[PDB]
Amino acid sequence: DLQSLPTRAYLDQTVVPILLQGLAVLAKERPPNPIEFLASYLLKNKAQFEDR
Amino acid sequence: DLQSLPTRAYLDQTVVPILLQGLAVLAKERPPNPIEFLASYLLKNKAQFEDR
Amino acid sequence: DLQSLPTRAYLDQTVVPILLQGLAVLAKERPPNPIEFLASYLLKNKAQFE
Amino acid sequence: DLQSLPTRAYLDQTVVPILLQGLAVLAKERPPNPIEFLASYLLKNKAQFE
Amino acid sequence: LYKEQIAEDIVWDIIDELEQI
């Protein structure tokens, strides 16, 4: 159950993998609006890491 | 300028602060759609960390 | 314009990013003169954050 | 001793009090070079916080 | 980073505390 996991395990399971992937792309591409880019990256790739 | 920075410095300056803030909120609230939540968090708070 | 921003946004856009890194390094290294160390860290890394 | 303290206690007992004051002054004055100003503030006031 | 999360906490507290002075 997710709500009872420790913070680190909770984050590691839910958002860390897609975030690391996203940060790697951000650093490579260095777009003009990095925060916006990272938010869009998350929504564009979220289906890879979860099935709703 | 920004495009010449090493990866670590680039990320530390552009997205790491708002991300850490967002991860803390995520970890406390544990919403049903964490990746979506984090993307929304970034867009809702980006104005704090940059001037668009 | 930075000068008219609210306090939080003003700080977030000027010193928070380098401060977060500086505090992390300070916490890791625990040097003998932490205030001196932190100020030195700001001056040494300023070019990467402004 | 300080070296064994957890991160939050260590920072609270070394740099947080002077940082709180430095950030307050920075926010009020909004100087042209905020990172430089903050580092100078630390060095100028550290005697009163050590 | 993890102490970055705690430096995060700290900076946020400070600023929020300045919100009330």
Residue numbers in the entry:
A (entry chain C), B (entry chain D): 47 to 98
C (entry chain A), D (entry chain B): 47 to 96
E (entry chain E): 480 to 500
Question: Paper's wording?
Answer:
From yeast to mammals, the SET1 and MLL-like (mixed-lineage leukemia) multi-subunit protein complexes, known as SET1 or MLL COMPASS, are responsible for H3K4 methylation. Dpy30 is an important subunit of MLL/SET1 complexes, where it plays an essential role in both catalyzing H3K4 trimethylation and maintaining the state of trimethylated H3K4. Dpy30 directly interacts with Ash2L in human (Bre2 in yeast) COMPASS through its Dpy30-binding motif (DBM). Although the structures of the human Dpy30 C-terminal domain (Dpy30C) and SPRY domain of Ash2L containing the DBM motif were solved, the binding mode and stoichiometry of Dpy30 and Ash2L within COMPASS remain uncertain, partly because the complex structure is lacking.
However, the complex of Dpy30C and Bre2DBM was crystallized successfully and the structure (Dpy30C-Bre2DBM) was solved to 2.15 Å resolution. The crystal structure of Dpy30C-Bre2DBM contains two dimers of Dpy30C (chain A and B: AB dimer; chain C and D: CD dimer) and only one copy of Bre2DBM (chain E) in an asymmetrical unit. Finally, two separated structures, with the orientation of the helix different from each other, were refined and showed similar qualities with Rwork/Rfree of 0.18/0.21 and 0.18/0.22, respectively. It is likely that the structure represents a mixed model, which was led by the fact that some DBM helices were bound in one orientation and the rest were in a reversed orientation in the complex crystal. In the two types of structures, the DBM peptide interacts with Dpy30C in the same mode and position, although in opposite orientation. The Bre2DBM peptide interacts simultaneously with two Dpy30C dimers, albeit with different affinities. The CD dimer plays a dominant role in Bre2DBM binding with a buried area of about 836.2 Å2, while the AB dimer assists in the interaction, forming a binding area of about 292.5 Å2 with Bre2. The interactions between Dpy30C and Bre2DBM are mainly hydrophobic without specific hydrogen-bond or salt-bond interactions. Ten hydrophobic residues from chains C and D of the Dpy30C dimer are distributed symmetrically on the inner surface in a semi-circular shape, forming a hydrophobic groove. In the Dpy30-Bre2DBM complex structure, two Dpy30 dimers form a loose tetramer with a crossing angle of 60°. Bre2DBM binding to Dpy30C increases this area to 1128.7 Å2, which stabilizes the Dpy30C tetramer. This structure represents a model of Dpy30 binding to the target helix at the ratio of 4:1.
